Design an enzyme around this catalytic site. Structure first.
Site, PDB file in Angstrom:
ATOM      1  N   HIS A 419      20.496   8.162  28.840  1.00 51.09           N
ATOM      2  CA  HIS A 419      21.303   9.372  28.859  1.00 51.09           C
ATOM      3  C   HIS A 419      22.551   9.195  28.000  1.00 51.09           C
ATOM      4  O   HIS A 419      22.886  10.062  27.192  1.00 51.09           O
ATOM      5  CB  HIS A 419      21.677   9.724  30.299  1.00 51.09           C
ATOM      6  CG  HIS A 419      22.721  10.794  30.416  1.00 51.09           C
ATOM      7  ND1 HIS A 419      22.431  12.056  30.888  1.00 51.09           N
ATOM      8  CD2 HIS A 419      24.045  10.778  30.154  1.00 51.09           C
ATOM      9  CE1 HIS A 419      23.541  12.778  30.898  1.00 51.09           C
ATOM     10  NE2 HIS A 419      24.530  12.029  30.456  1.00 51.09           N
ATOM     11  N   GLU A 420      23.236   8.068  28.178  1.00 49.88           N
ATOM     12  CA  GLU A 420      24.441   7.782  27.407  1.00 49.88           C
ATOM     13  C   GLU A 420      24.121   7.615  25.928  1.00 49.88           C
ATOM     14  O   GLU A 420      24.866   8.075  25.068  1.00 49.88           O
ATOM     15  CB  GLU A 420      25.141   6.528  27.932  1.00 49.88           C
ATOM     16  CG  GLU A 420      25.539   6.593  29.396  1.00 49.88           C
ATOM     17  CD  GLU A 420      26.621   7.615  29.674  1.00 49.88           C
ATOM     18  OE1 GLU A 420      26.930   7.831  30.864  1.00 49.88           O
ATOM     19  OE2 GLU A 420      27.170   8.198  28.716  1.00 49.88           O
ATOM     20  N   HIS A 423      24.039  10.734  24.120  1.00 47.27           N
ATOM     21  CA  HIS A 423      25.338  11.206  23.659  1.00 47.27           C
ATOM     22  C   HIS A 423      25.635  10.705  22.254  1.00 47.27           C
ATOM     23  O   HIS A 423      26.116  11.453  21.402  1.00 47.27           O
ATOM     24  CB  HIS A 423      26.442  10.750  24.603  1.00 47.27           C
ATOM     25  CG  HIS A 423      26.635  11.640  25.789  1.00 47.27           C
ATOM     26  ND1 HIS A 423      26.700  13.015  25.681  1.00 47.27           N
ATOM     27  CD2 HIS A 423      26.803  11.355  27.096  1.00 47.27           C
ATOM     28  CE1 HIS A 423      26.887  13.534  26.879  1.00 47.27           C
ATOM     29  NE2 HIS A 423      26.955  12.552  27.756  1.00 47.27           N
ATOM     30  N   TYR A 461      22.749  18.703  37.088  1.00 47.28           N
ATOM     31  CA  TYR A 461      23.942  18.218  36.406  1.00 47.28           C
ATOM     32  C   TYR A 461      23.961  18.619  34.938  1.00 47.28           C
ATOM     33  O   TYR A 461      25.027  18.718  34.329  1.00 47.28           O
ATOM     34  CB  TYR A 461      24.066  16.698  36.518  1.00 47.28           C
ATOM     35  CG  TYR A 461      25.340  16.202  35.885  1.00 47.28           C
ATOM     36  CD1 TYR A 461      26.574  16.553  36.414  1.00 47.28           C
ATOM     37  CD2 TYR A 461      25.316  15.420  34.738  1.00 47.28           C
ATOM     38  CE1 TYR A 461      27.752  16.123  35.834  1.00 47.28           C
ATOM     39  CE2 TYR A 461      26.489  14.983  34.150  1.00 47.28           C
ATOM     40  CZ  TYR A 461      27.704  15.338  34.702  1.00 47.28           C
ATOM     41  OH  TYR A 461      28.876  14.911  34.124  1.00 47.28           O
ATOM     42  N   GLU A 468      26.413  17.564  28.040  1.00 48.84           N
ATOM     43  CA  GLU A 468      25.672  16.975  29.151  1.00 48.84           C
ATOM     44  C   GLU A 468      24.224  17.443  29.145  1.00 48.84           C
ATOM     45  O   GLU A 468      23.311  16.669  29.436  1.00 48.84           O
ATOM     46  CB  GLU A 468      26.329  17.326  30.492  1.00 48.84           C
ATOM     47  CG  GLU A 468      27.846  17.129  30.546  1.00 48.84           C
ATOM     48  CD  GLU A 468      28.288  15.676  30.449  1.00 48.84           C
ATOM     49  OE1 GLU A 468      27.446  14.798  30.185  1.00 48.84           O
ATOM     50  OE2 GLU A 468      29.495  15.411  30.634  1.00 48.84           O
TER      51      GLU A 468
HETATM   52  C1  41S Z   1      22.790   6.701  37.538  1.00 47.76           C
HETATM   53  O1  41S Z   1      23.282   5.963  36.421  1.00 47.76           O
HETATM   54  C2  41S Z   1      24.232   6.513  35.601  1.00 47.76           C
HETATM   55  C3  41S Z   1      24.987   7.594  36.041  1.00 47.76           C
HETATM   56  C4  41S Z   1      25.952   8.151  35.209  1.00 47.76           C
HETATM   57  S1  41S Z   1      26.818   9.392  35.713  1.00 47.76           S
HETATM   58  O2  41S Z   1      28.121   8.936  36.108  1.00 47.76           O
HETATM   59  O3  41S Z   1      26.166  10.008  36.834  1.00 47.76           O
HETATM   60  N1  41S Z   1      26.956  10.405  34.587  1.00 47.76           N
HETATM   61  C5  41S Z   1      25.961  11.437  34.334  1.00 47.76           C
HETATM   62  C6  41S Z   1      24.618  10.723  34.433  1.00 47.76           C
HETATM   63  C7  41S Z   1      23.582  11.603  35.120  1.00 47.76           C
HETATM   64  C8  41S Z   1      24.133  10.280  33.058  1.00 47.76           C
HETATM   65  C9  41S Z   1      28.091  10.419  33.678  1.00 47.76           C
HETATM   66  C10 41S Z   1      27.710  10.945  32.326  1.00 47.76           C
HETATM   67  O4  41S Z   1      27.343  12.332  32.087  1.00 47.76           O
HETATM   68  N2  41S Z   1      27.699  10.119  31.274  1.00 47.76           N
HETATM   69  O5  41S Z   1      27.353  10.626  30.082  1.00 47.76           O
HETATM   70  C11 41S Z   1      29.101  11.362  34.323  1.00 47.76           C
HETATM   71  C12 41S Z   1      29.607  10.798  35.646  1.00 47.76           C
HETATM   72  C13 41S Z   1      30.257  11.655  33.376  1.00 47.76           C
HETATM   73  C14 41S Z   1      26.159   7.627  33.938  1.00 47.76           C
HETATM   74  C15 41S Z   1      25.403   6.547  33.503  1.00 47.76           C
HETATM   75  C16 41S Z   1      24.439   5.991  34.336  1.00 47.76           C
HETATM   76  F1  41S Z   1      23.708   4.944  33.913  1.00 47.76           F
HETATM   77 ZN    ZN Z   2      26.885  12.657  30.086  1.00 50.83          ZN
END
Ligand code: 41S
Ligand code: ZN
Length: 510
Positions: A419-420, A423, A461, A468
């Site tokens: 996910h990151e 970005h 989310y 996002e």
């Molecule tokens: C479950 O493992 C993870 C969870 C997150 S997170 O903190 O929940 N999250 C959104 C998630 C769903 C990617 C963060 C995000 O949008 N980063 O781009 C927000 C909190 C700002 C991040 C990285 C992970 F590996």
């Molecule tokens: Zn994010």
């Protein structure tokens, strides 16, 4: 084996030290044990009427940047407000929707966070990993923590000694969530609560070999019966020169910055429930640190080769300072492996090369993200700093991943990293479109209106915003679960093609 003789013997060893304490130094130790919680009354008195009213109707856990550390408290505050069908009314449509916070709700809470921090020395040390000069709190309080910490270090000067160190065990009860909020929730077997998931016991044991305490451990001279959520039971053997102090009622406060080697992790039975016994030995922190640095130096060489990068490129960082040290290191290996397997070689290489040009990092840490330099050097305002399990910071070209914390409804760390990385994809694609002023491709005309249509189709989310949404779609487009990828193609076909477009566009750039 006499508990009470053991107790009396350790107390005598520190009797001079105790009697030599000023009441200044006595209160300092008390303040450490019992943190000074913020006073709810003075807070609400400071709020305006619009803010008192706004505080009533806001559904808190929707937020992503708080810690429930910080979220616990605001609802404690919310009821003190509501003092006659109030409770049912104000808490009616709770389960109806996990809707995203309004921007005026966000900005309010982002500044209310600065006023609800308890003065907690041990917590400050753990959150910052000992780097207490980190600009994530008010400078005056920051200086105040420093004065207290330096004074406490000065109090803890008497080592346990050559005689007592190998005659006694010391014990610590711990919540599993304090090490891993993710694994903790389901390490207690679901069918039976009094027993431990064996496959998930082995989980926690393969990768736990060393530990770090960056704050002051408060241990028991004799083992105390586990409370509700205390399923871990530490048994610590001190080293001869480990500096500690006697606390009332059979406890010891150990010095900060010590290292712990894991010698044995087992399942034990105590009073008809299963517990995880952790046998650990105090070693110098610098010993553990060298292992961490060797692991960082190593994993970079593996990945510099596998990515076609210069041999001494600094890409992966191990920012590790806390009790679940080795697993942070071990999980980082696992995460980047899943990342290599579920994403095309050529997408990984070209985007990562882009990150390197901006001196970016993959940061794996057990200290909170506001205290990671890759964030705070570009985020002066504390009300704009963010704590979450993960983050991508464009200004620093860095991916930040916080081990211990739990994700907003997400399976594993590996899916969150992807996910990151999604970005970073958004960033590079937007850069390739216009190298002069690099913006996100999700801040492009095309994708914006894609988001206003298909935006509320994917994850709950992913509805937060354009950036996002792109990221959640990217993640799900690269899940091991073949089913998940098809929903994206079906429930959001334009986003599906749009992302795949940018993927093609990235790979074919010269
Ligand atoms: C479950 O493992 C993870 C969870 C997150 S997170 O903190 O929940 N999250 C959104 C998630 C769903 C990617 C963060 C995000 O949008 N980063 O781009 C927000 C909190 C700002 C991040 C990285 C992970 F590996
Ligand atoms: Zn994010």
């Amino acid at each position: 084996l006499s508990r009470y003789e053991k107790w009396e013997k350790i107390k005598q060893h520190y009797q001079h030290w105790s009697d030599s304490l000023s009441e200044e130094g006595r209160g300092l130790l008390k303040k450490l044990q019992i943190p000074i919680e913020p006073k709810k009354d003075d807070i609400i008195h400071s709020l305006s009427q619009e803010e008192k009213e706004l505080l009533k109707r806001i559904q808190i856990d929707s937020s992503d940047f708080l810690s429930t550390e910080e979220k616990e408290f605001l609802k404690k505050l919310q009821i003190d407000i509501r003092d006659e069908e109030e409770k049912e009314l104000l808490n009616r449509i709770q389960v109806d929707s996990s809707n995203p916070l309004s921007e005026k709700e966000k900005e309010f809470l982002k500044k209310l966070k600065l006023d609800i921090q308890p003065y907690d020395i041990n917590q400050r040390l753990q959150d910052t990993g000992g780097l207490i000069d980190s600009p994530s709190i008010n400078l005056d309080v920051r200086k105040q923590y420093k004065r207290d910490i330096q004074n406490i270090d000065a109090l803890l000067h008497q080592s346990i000694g050559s005689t007592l160190y190998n005659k006694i065990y010391l014990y610590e009860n711990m919540n599993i969530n304090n090490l891993t909020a993710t694994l903790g929730a389901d390490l207690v077997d679901s069918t039976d609560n009094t027993k431990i998931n064996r496959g998930i016991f082995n989980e926690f044991k393969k990768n736990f070999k060393y530990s770090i305490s960056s704050n002051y451990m408060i241990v028991d001279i004799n083992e105390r019966p586990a409370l509700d959520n205390e399923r871990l039971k530490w048994r610590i053997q001190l080293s001869p020169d480990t500096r500690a102090g006697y606390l009332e009622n059979g406890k010891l406060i150990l010095q900060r910055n010590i290292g712990l080697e894991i010698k044995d992790v087992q399942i034990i039975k105590q009073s008809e429930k299963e517990y995880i016994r952790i046998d650990a030995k105090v070693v110098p922190k610098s010993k553990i640190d060298t292992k961490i640095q060797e692991a960082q130096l190593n994993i970079n060489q593996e990945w510099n080769k596998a990515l076609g990068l210069p041999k001494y490129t600094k890409l992966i960082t191990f920012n590790v300072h806390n009790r679940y040290a080795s697993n942070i290191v071990e999980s980082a290996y696992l995460i980047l492996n899943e990342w290599k397997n579920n994403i095309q070689s050529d997408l990984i290489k070209k985007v990562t090369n882009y990150l390197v040009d901006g001196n970016g990092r993959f940061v794996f840490t057990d200290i909170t993200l506001p205290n990671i330099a890759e964030q705070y050097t570009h985020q002066d305002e504390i009300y704009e700093q963010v704590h979450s399990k993960g983050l991508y910071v464009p200004e620093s070209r860095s991916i930040l991943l916080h081990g211990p914390s739990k994700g907003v409804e997400l399976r594993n760390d590996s899916e969150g990293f992807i996910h990151e990385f999604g970005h970073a994809v958004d960033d590079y694609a937007g850069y390739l479109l216009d190298k002069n002023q690099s913006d996100l491709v999700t801040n492009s005309k095309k994708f914006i209106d894609i988001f206003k249509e298909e935006g509320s189709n994917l994850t709950s989310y992913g509805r937060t915003n354009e950036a996002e949404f792109f990221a959640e779609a990217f993640r799900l487009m690269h899940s091991t679960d073949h089913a998940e990828r098809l929903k994206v193609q079906k429930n959001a076909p334009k986003t599906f093609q749009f992302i795949n477009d940018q993927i093609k566009f990235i790979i074919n750039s010269l």
